[PDB]
Structures are given as C-alpha cells and as structure tokens.
C-alpha cells in the first residue's frame, strides 16, 4: 500500500492530515481564557435518548490546576489523559511543586508523532488543555495529533469549529469576566449544536487559582442557560 510516516508532495504527513478530518467529525468543544479563569465547555451529543448523558465524559481533570476538553475519536484520548496525569504527578514528586501548563502540554504532544512501523497511527483526537500556574497565569492550549500545540485566548474544536472560531473572533476581549465567558461558551455551543442546548446534552467547566479545576453540575449549568436566554431576549 504505502508507508504510515509518508510525506505528501505538498510536504505534509498523510496520516496526520487524515486524523484532522476525523477531528472535524467530532463533537464541538470550546475553551475561553480570561484573567479570572479559563472556561471549558463541550457538546455531549448522545446517539440515543436511552444513553445516560451524565456518563459522557468529554471534560476531564489532569491535576488540580489543569483541566482538559476533547473532540474527535474520544477513545484515543484515554492514554493521552493517563500520560498527562502521570506527568503532572511525577513532576510534583521530583520537584515538590505544580507543573507548568505549557510543560504538561509539551509532554502530551511528545506522544503525538510517536507512530510508525511505537503505536500504529496518530491520535484521532484534539485536546483543549486549560490551566493555571504562577509563572504565566491562566492559559489555554490546543494540542493536535501533529505534535504541534498553540496557545489561545479562545479556541473551538470539532464539527462547528470554523463557525464558532469566527464568533469567538468578534466576542473575545481581554477584560472578560468569568461569568461573561461561561455564557459566551453556552451561546456559541447553542449556535453550532444540531440538537437544542440544555443542561443534559452540554457540559461546562472551569479552572480558577483558588478553587482549582471544577466540572459544573447540571443544576448550576441549567441556571446559566436560563440566564443566557433572558439576556438574549433582552435586546
């Protein structure tokens, strides 16, 4: 057939480019970074009403100061999360401190290109890694299967990514509050989601310096959705 680690005539790795197509088919995940915290939100996208939606875990804790949202072939993310958690805990063991969000992201991205004929293919999943450290403050990273990671003020990945990113382009400014960011994720998720947004088919989370990483309750998220509807109907 053809090599797994083959370059195309344009100078790109076929398998990496194809894994990016798989991520486009994945459910939408949005991250917004502010000076009061970083917010992570996801579309759950249950394939049937009999599927208990609370068992859909697309937002995940890496450490107390680092959270993670995923999009694409979510089964592939489990080993990436395991590595990340191990890296975060191992660094704390060696250095008696929290690990930098960038260093954690770099550790995850080192796995990405370890494929050939090591694992048999790249990961089919993109990660939004959000966190906080004392050196660089609140940070949001986008970790791809290419091994590249970009820092973002705000970022959307998944099926409604290009539409959501254009919306994040206009809406984001440097003086956003945490509450403003929460509603903004819910607003953009509702726009790109096929089904109607509610507390059962969408999930919110955040990371603050004081309280650390927290996944939001369905009751808490429900109030933010109700607050969103009223403020949109307000004008």
């Amino acid at each position: 057939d053809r090599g797994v680690s083959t370059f195309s005539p344009e100078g790109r790795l076929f398998q990496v480019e194809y894994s990016l197509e798989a991520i486009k088919l994945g459910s939408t995940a949005i991250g917004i970074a502010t000076k009061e915290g970083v917010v992570l939100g996801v579309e759950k996208r249950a394939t049937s009403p009999l599927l208990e939606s609370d068992s859909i875990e697309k937002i995940v804790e890496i450490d107390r100061h680092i959270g993670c949202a995923m999009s694409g072939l979510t089964a592939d993310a489990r080993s990436m999360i395991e590595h990340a958690r191990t890296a975060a805990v191992t660094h704390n063991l060696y250095y008696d401190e929290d690990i930098n969000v960038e260093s954690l992201t770099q550790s995850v991205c080192d796995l990405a290109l370890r494929f050939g004929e090591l694992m048999s293919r790249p990961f089919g999943v993109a990660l939004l890694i959000a966190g906080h450290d004392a050196d660089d403050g609140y940070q949001l990273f986008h970790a791809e299967p290419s091994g590249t990671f970009y820092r973002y003020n705000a970022k959307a990945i998944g099926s409604g990514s290009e539409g959501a990113q254009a919306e994040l382009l206009n809406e984001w400014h440097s003086s956003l509050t945490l509450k403003e960011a929460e509603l903004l994720v819910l607003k953009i998720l509702k726009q790109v989601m096929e089904e109607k947004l509610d507390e059962n088919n969408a999930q919110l989370s955040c990371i603050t310096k004081q309280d650390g990483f927290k996944i939001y309750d369905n009751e808490k998220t429900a109030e933010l959705i109700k607050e969103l509807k009223e403020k949109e109907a307000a004008e």
């Binding site: 804790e61 890496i62 450490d63 395991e82 958690r85 191990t86 805990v89 191992t90 704390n92 063991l93």
Partner: protein
Amino acid sequence: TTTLAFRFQGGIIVAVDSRATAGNWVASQTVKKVIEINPFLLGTIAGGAADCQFWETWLGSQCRLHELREKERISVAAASKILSNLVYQYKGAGLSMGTMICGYTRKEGPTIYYVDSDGTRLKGDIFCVGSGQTFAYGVLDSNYKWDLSVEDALYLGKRSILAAAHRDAYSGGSVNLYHVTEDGWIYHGNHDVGELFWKVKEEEGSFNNVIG
C-alpha cells in the same frame, strides 16, 4: 525512635518523637517522623528514614493518581496495600521500614495499618513502633479506652511518647501530635520534651524518682 497511633471514638491520634541518632551521636532533635501523605492520610517513620520518606511520599503520588482515575477517595486499605506490595518486591534488598498508615474514610471509619519492610501488613487499634515502643505501650494499654475525648486522647499520645523519651536513650527531642478525622488530619503542634517533662512532672505528680 518512638512512634504510636491508636483508634478511638474521635478518630485516630498519631504521636511521634523527634530524635535522630547515628550511634551515640545525636544527629538531630527536630526530625519529622510523620509523613503527610495527603490531607487525609498520615504515615509514621521508623527504621530507615530515607526509605520511609521516599516511599510514603511516592505513596501520596499513587493515591493522587487513584482518585484522579476513580473519582473517589482511596481507602486506607488500598493505600496501605500499595505500600506493602511495593516493599515486598524489594524484600531481601535491605529496606528498613516500620510504619503506621493512618486514615479516616466513610466506608472504613478510622483505620490504622501497620506496614513493615518484611512485607507485613496488619490492621489494628493500637500500634507502637521504634526503640522506645515498649515504654509507650505501657502507658497506652493501661489508660486506653474507646470512649476517650479528643482532648484526653491527644494527651495520652503525648504522655506515652514522653514516657519513652525519658527512658529510651534513642528517643526524645520533641513530641509531634496529629488528630485524624474524616474531613482530614489536624496538626496539634510541636512539644519540646525538656519543657514538657517538668510541666507533666509538676501537674501530674509523676516521675517522683527524678529530682526537679
């Protein structure tokens, strides 16, 4: 060294001395013999200091990875067994460890596991480990009751280390107290044995043999 830990109505009391010796030479009087594994779990130090420090710090890392994966507090049983299984792999290599893994969970209640570098793992209500263990056991056995108050239990642990600190040449310096509750451990301060001895002698009327 003298370290103890016992279960009671109000949870667990952990008490240790602070002396470190190399032969007759007193290397330190300010050694920490309670490892704060995490906010809910405590571990005592006896035998090899490095072996206890290193592997119980390591245990804390494993406990953290457990509750990240399982989204649930690790049991005292599971935590203690991670340590005992680890040291058992090294059996014969020369590790020196005698520790109490102490914790308070919903499903178990207050639990103490004695763990050994021989691979021994014992659940129990009262444990004393170290060169001054026999002295501490005497005070504990004669005064222990399940229905002790948190105040009295803390004193009993303090008084038992003092008993050993006095008689055992390789124990002393100061007494460190901890109280383990379901919501986590609470530190109850460092108590210099020199000052504590005279205080206890006068107030309690004990140690009449000693001139003060």
